[PDB]
Amino acid sequence: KKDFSTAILERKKSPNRLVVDEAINDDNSVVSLHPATMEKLQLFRGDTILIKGKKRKDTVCIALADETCEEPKIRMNKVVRSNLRVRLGDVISVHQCPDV
Amino acid sequence: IVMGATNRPNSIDPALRRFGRFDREIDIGVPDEIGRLEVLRIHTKNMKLAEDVDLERISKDTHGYVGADLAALCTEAALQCIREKMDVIDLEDDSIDAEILNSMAVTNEHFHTALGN
Amino acid sequence: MMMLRIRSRDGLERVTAEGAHITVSQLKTLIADQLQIPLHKQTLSTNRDLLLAKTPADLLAFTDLTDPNLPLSSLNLGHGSMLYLAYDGERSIPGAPPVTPAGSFGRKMTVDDLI
């Protein structure tokens, strides 16, 4: 069994949320994923996605692909991560924006 | 008709117990086993609960409890039942599954845990 | 079955078609029947500057995809391909997730603020 006295705080795994870490590209509106993530999420090249972070903060960024990126990581640059009020090793959800 | 209410009749003004003002004094004491059983049966009428609920055991185990404390115990049991299901419900999704919402029922173990707490 | 992305001034949408064997006319018919966009307003192109025009004549000037006769297979369209659709007027693309406004954190009221 498990101790459920603190059963609310822990996150739940989902194919809609990934982990945040460093990247290479340094454009203010780009984030680099792995193509397997796009295949799982049914996302394609050049799509503009919505990123939701801590304390009800969110932004819009263009998602590109690279083989170097790992599937459970998002490779978020420093500027966007600062805007999301997060640090490397946290959980960030991803969605798609239909209206540019 | 005037109906007072207090906790210790000694602490009231001694001049209010004279003939004609407050001449009847009734002592609503702590209920016994059957009283606690009836209070629990009254309070758990609306809650969903499985057939395993053993209200007699809960009544016997609770000693020194009053009606308010038994209402608190029932609320604690319901909250414990929700908390045990919390491990599968996701707070980010307000669309809780309908079958999940109707698959939650309080049992005897949750009552025992709430009594312990 | 092939999925084609449709970029417009309002944003981005997607359409599922039988395949690349159909022509631009069939693609326009499917767009009309699915996205409810009238035929007389739909203008297709491959350049990103199509949405930068401000006149239906300018939209039709991009004849790389304006002509309905041209087959879609000849354009090398595939799964997840990019197309640009321009139409008269401005619409709200469905499927928009809720977005919180900027600065709406910490609505700490006070008694003095109430006064």
From Swiss-Prot, chain A:
Question: Where is this gene product found?
Answer: Nucleus; Cytoplasm, Cytoskeleton, Phragmoplast; Cell membrane
Cleavable signal peptide: none
UniProt modified residues of type Phosphoserine:
S29
UniProt superkingdom: Eukaryota
The protein's PTM annotation reads:
Phosphorylated on at least one threonine residue and on Ser-29 by SERK1.
Q: How does it assemble?
A: Homohexamer. Interacts with SERK1, GRF6, KAPP and SYP31, but not with KNOLLE. Component of the SERK1 signaling complex, composed of KAPP, CDC48A, GRF6 or GRF7, SERK1, SERK2, SERK3/BAK1 and BRI1. Interacts with PUX1, PUX2, PUX3, PUX4, PUX5, PUX7 and PUX11 via its N-terminus.
Explain the purpose of this protein: Probably functions in cell division and growth processes. Interacts with certain SNAREs as part of specialized membrane fusion events where vesicles from the same organelle fuse (homotypic fusion).
Which family is it part of?
Belongs to the AAA ATPase family.
Q: What is this protein called?
A: Cell division control protein 48 homolog A
Q: Say which species the protein is native to.
A: Arabidopsis thaliana
What high-level taxonomic lineage is stated for the organism? Eukaryota, Viridiplantae, Streptophyta, Embryophyta, Tracheophyta
The coding gene here is CDC48A
* Positions spanned in the full protein: 13 to 112 of 809
From Swiss-Prot, chain B:
Q: Which domain of life, per UniProt?
A: Eukaryota
List residues binding ADP. Answer: H43
Q: Which cell locations does it reside in?
A: Nucleus; Cytoplasm, Cytoskeleton, Phragmoplast; Cell membrane
Similarity comment text for this entry: Belongs to the AAA ATPase family.
Protein purpose: Probably functions in cell division and growth processes. Interacts with certain SNAREs as part of specialized membrane fusion events where vesicles from the same organelle fuse (homotypic fusion).
This protein's assembly is summarised as: Homohexamer. Interacts with SERK1, GRF6, KAPP and SYP31, but not with KNOLLE. Component of the SERK1 signaling complex, composed of KAPP, CDC48A, GRF6 or GRF7, SERK1, SERK2, SERK3/BAK1 and BRI1. Interacts with PUX1, PUX2, PUX3, PUX4, PUX5, PUX7 and PUX11 via its N-terminus.
Q: What is this protein called?
A: Cell division control protein 48 homolog A
The organism's taxonomy opens as:
Eukaryota, Viridiplantae, Streptophyta, Embryophyta, Tracheophyta
UniProtKB/Swiss-Prot annotation, chain C:
Task: State any GO BP term from the record.
Answer: proteasome-mediated ubiquitin-dependent protein catabolic process
**Name assigned to this protein:** NPL4-like protein 2
**Species this chain originates from:** Arabidopsis thaliana (Mouse-ear cress)
Q: Does the keyword Cytoplasm apply?
A: no
> What keyword terms does UniProt attach to this protein?
Phosphoprotein, Ubl conjugation pathway
Query: Its biological function?
Result: May be part of a complex that binds ubiquitinated proteins and that is necessary for the export of misfolded proteins from the ER to the cytoplasm, where they are degraded by the proteasome.
Phosphoserine sites (modified residues): S104
**Family per similarity comment:** Belongs to the NPL4 family.
Give the domain of life: Eukaryota
GO CC annotations?
cytosol
